[PDB]
């Protein structure tokens, strides 16, 4: 899975800084890339870091509500006109957990563009696990839940 895009998400400590990096797998800068980020449990974007991401016409976020320096979008969308195929157009912003629940659930970051809406490059991110996949003990074809 995840052809047509190089996407790997990491998240590092500091509330903890979430960093996304992406690169197109073609020859031309692909037009109208959509970043589709869904938060963890109880984590909200910083309203002064996401505002820094939306400076200009290069990157466009929709209308979001602001409260207690937290953006009120659990799923957040980043529209940007081009994605580079030589370098890595990275971006980063902080996710502020206010209310704490047991058993944090993995977030997700999706990438797709206009001419490929049949693109399914998703990569989950967990603040404790590396790959972001929730735990399962899996022997070949058949699989089970670890817990």
Give resolution in angstroms: 3.3
Solved using? cryo-EM
**Sign of CA pseudo-dihedral 64, 50, 68, 132:** positive
Please answer whether residues 2 and 120 qualify as being in contact, where contact means their C-beta atoms are separated by less than 8 angstroms. yes
Give the separation between CA 60 and CA 56, rounded to whole angstroms. Answer: 8
**Which residue's entry shows tokens 């972001």?**
132
DSSP sequence for 45-102: EBTTTHHHHT-SSSEE-----EETTEES-SEEEEEEEEE-SSS---EEEEEEE-S--S
Count of beta carbons in the 10 Å neighbourhood of residue 69? 14
């Amino acid at each position: 899975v995840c052809n047509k895009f190089h996407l790997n998400v990491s998240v590092e400590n500091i509330a903890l800084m979430l960093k996304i990096c992406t690169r197109y797998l073609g020859e031309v800068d692909s037009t109208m890339t959509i970043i589709d980020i869904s938060m963890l449990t109880g984590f909200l974007p910083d309203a002064e870091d996401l505002t820094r991401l939306s400076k200009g016409v290069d990157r466009y976020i929709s209308r979001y509500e602001v409260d207690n320096n937290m953006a009120q979008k659990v799923a957040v969308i980043i529209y940007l006109n081009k994605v580079s195929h030589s370098e890595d157009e990275c971006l980063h912003f902080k996710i502020l957990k206010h209310f704490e629940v047991g058993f944090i659930q993995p977030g997700s970051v999706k990438v797709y563009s206009y001419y490929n809406l049949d693109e399914k490059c998703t990569k989950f991110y967990h603040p404790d696990k590396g790959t972001g996949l929730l735990n399962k003990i899996c022997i070949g074809n058949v699989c089970r839940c670890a817990g």
